[PDB]
Design a protein around this ligand. Sequence first.
Ligand SMILES: [Ca+2]
Ligand SMILES: [Zn+2]
Length: 530
Amino acid sequence: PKSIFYNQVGYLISGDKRFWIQAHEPQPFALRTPEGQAVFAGMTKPVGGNWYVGDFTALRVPGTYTLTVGTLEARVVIHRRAYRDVLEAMLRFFDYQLCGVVLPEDEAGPWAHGACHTSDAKVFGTERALACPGGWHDAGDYGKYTVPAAKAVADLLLAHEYFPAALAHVRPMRSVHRAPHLPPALEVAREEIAWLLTMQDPATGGVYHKVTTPSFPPLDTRPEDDDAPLVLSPISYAATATFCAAMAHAALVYRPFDPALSSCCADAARRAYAWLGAHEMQPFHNPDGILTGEYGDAELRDELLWASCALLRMTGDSAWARVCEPLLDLDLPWELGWADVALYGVMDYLRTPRAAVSDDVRNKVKSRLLRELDALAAMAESHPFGIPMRDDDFIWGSNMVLLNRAMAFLLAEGVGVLHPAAHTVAQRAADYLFGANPLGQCYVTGFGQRPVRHPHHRPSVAADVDHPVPGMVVGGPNRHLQDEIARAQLAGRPAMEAYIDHQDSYSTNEVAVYWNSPAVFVIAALLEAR
Ligand SMILES: [Ca+2]
Ligand SMILES: [Zn+2]
């Protein structure tokens, strides 16, 4: 497959521009207008392994150019807002996943419905029932889970706070949101917050782990065709803590837009934390008779960290610094979910007014955060595609691992922790996700020259349209070959090549709400840069 590897979505006018080829020496290259006029030229340079890169960043005039190097040819496009449409489709994906709510045909097209899982969820072990209407279907399945929901919400909320201008005029589905009509990111994220609120037991303040069917309906199964009884898995520490942090964050962001919802989230967060103080950290386990997504976790101190730090920033009360800061000194991995969420708390802590926290602890936190970014930067400098990844990092949901890492750079920039490689990593992450990889694969449905055509997504599989729901970020290459398709097809291939666009490859070609949400953040960042 001797080919030119590039960002198949496009390049920003004022953005960094790079293409990849396999070679053993530098080669001259050139870009020409559609009419054949040479407008740019340069030399490729080695970046490790068999890989060479070409840099045409200085080419600022928008349009479609013919890139030539050696005998190889490719067409790249430069646009003022090249990632405008893909960002829109990425946020619109959340509306496509909406549950218990009719999606109008004029907006949802061939994947329209219809109200799925309207059944009042029976609490596990009992006959009492609460109405738990979504909200979003988590992944390719239709299950709704509290823990990963908190990440998806937090990311979209963070995307709004950081890059409101880039998201200001993206349009979610028209007839599914209420008043006051919020900025698109907040307009979309509110739906998941609303469902999450109904997941909190008013009796104990605790939060149910997941409301799903007992088992997984077939890949072919339509949402409404899935009418199995809805189980309500027990309250868990992880569910309550992540709920608490997400609500405290929601209560803070939505205040100048929806004061009514802001008030409701704040009270829900406090009650949720009250539960944490009276219950031990117990790892969730699937109830007997439940085989849906467990989303378990044995380490729960980072959840408490996030919950504490979120309430710290929500209240601005230095009383929270007493519980936050000891947890911040722990050697927990500072990551962005869904299981390891410590960095979310770190950010809330750093975005808290300096007068409410300890200076020496704040300096230590900033110092560690920079070290972590330094390590990622070193990884990106060694990687041929400039992304903060090693071979053993390419596991289940490697694209989220990548995107979370790019997000960490951009988040830290917002709190005065500026690493010089931050915006380079952001572009490289987008390049990789949009085709700049050993497979030349655009890992987003409905975009690029080699798009994802057969994702592990039941609404997409159900419809016989031979093209899935657009704007879905798939899991990406997984070296552990954790499905029957991958183990047969992808055996022997390098980590970055451990992907296949097969609808039955759920460990490489699955989608998720918490996979699109960091994608929204990173892509919005690139558009905001202008
Ligand atoms: Ca954890
Ligand atoms: Zn549903």
